[PDB]
Amino acid sequence: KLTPLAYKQFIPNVAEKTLGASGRYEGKITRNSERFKELTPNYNPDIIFKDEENTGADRLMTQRCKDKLNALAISVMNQWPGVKLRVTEGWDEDGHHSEESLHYEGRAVDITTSDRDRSKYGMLARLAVEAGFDWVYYESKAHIHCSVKAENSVAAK
Ligand SMILES: [Zn+2]
């Protein structure tokens, strides 16, 4: 049934910013920016947020990102009861990602299972695809990168 993604594999098998995947980068969103209004905090009790910066930034994301993440939170517990979805990186306020990263606009999250059992990540990535994320990439052994389209792209003119 559900086949895990392999290390470095991405679904769909196209570049992230293509229309069939997560679409175009709309630009960085910062706390001081006009675009900040676009982000809403996700306080789903079934999701662990690393929040290493202690700023709550990992929780701020677009509605579509929230929707897909919330659906994934359900499938993770269904796949491994007692284990929760965990976000290690979300909206990046400090340039820790490549130029034009969707993390800069709350459209991407790096995830793991709460038990940090890396053998579960290929399968987690698959659940992420079934959860509706527009692009899922088994980026590193430490996490799965998941991104979504901007609302402008979901209903493109
Ligand atoms: Zn990422």
Side-chain angles (χ1 to χ4, degrees), residues 16-17 22 25 100-108 147-148:
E16 184 177 43
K17 314 295 195 293
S22 293
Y25 163 75
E100 301 193 57
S101 173
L102 293 194
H103 279 275
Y104 293 140
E105 54 179 312
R107 281 206 276 138
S147 62
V148 294

Side-chain angles (χ1 to χ4, degrees), residues 83-97:
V83 179
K84 286 184 178 182
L85 170 60
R86 168 178 172 264
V87 174
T88 54
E89 174 69 341
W91 176 47
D92 180 9
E93 300 191 69
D94 334 277
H96 297 139
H97 293 297

Side-chain angles (χ1 to χ4, degrees), residues 26-80:
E26 310 269 319
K28 230 163 85 293
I29 294 179
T30 68
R31 293 201 185 254
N32 344 266
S33 81
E34 306 166 334
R35 309 257 320 278
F36 188 65
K37 300 148 54 178
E38 290 168 30
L39 307 178
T40 38
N42 190 146
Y43 282 101
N44 191 329
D46 294 327
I47 305 174
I48 306 312
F49 290 89
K50 191 180 194 293
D51 183 37
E52 67 186 32
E53 300 290 320
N54 191 218
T55 56
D58 274 356
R59 297 173 180 274
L60 290 159
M61 52 187 74
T62 66
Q63 172 73 338
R64 186 177 181 79
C65 196
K66 279 184 83 304
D67 288 348
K68 276 34 174 180
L69 195 63
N70 288 341
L72 182 52
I74 301 172
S75 53
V76 172
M77 291 179 103
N78 183 75
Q79 187 71 26
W80 306 288

Side-chain angles (χ1 to χ4, degrees), residues 16 89-90 97 101 103 108-111 137 139 143-146:
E16 184 177 43
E89 174 69 341
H97 293 297
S101 173
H103 279 275
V109 289
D110 293 332
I111 61 168
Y137 172 44
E139 189 177 11
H143 68 249
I144 307 308
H145 167 102
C146 301

Side-chain angles (χ1 to χ4, degrees), residues 105-151:
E105 54 179 312
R107 281 206 276 138
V109 289
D110 293 332
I111 61 168
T112 72
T113 37
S114 59
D115 60 4
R116 299 176 70 245
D117 173 6
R118 301 185 172 199
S119 68
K120 286 187 179 79
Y121 301 1
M123 182 51 137
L124 169 64
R126 165 55 58 187
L127 296 174
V129 172
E130 305 311 313
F133 274 100
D134 305 300
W135 199 71
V136 170
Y137 172 44
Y138 198 148
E139 189 177 11
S140 64
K141 301 298 198 62
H143 68 249
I144 307 308
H145 167 102
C146 301
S147 62
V148 294
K149 301 172 180 301
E151 285 300 322

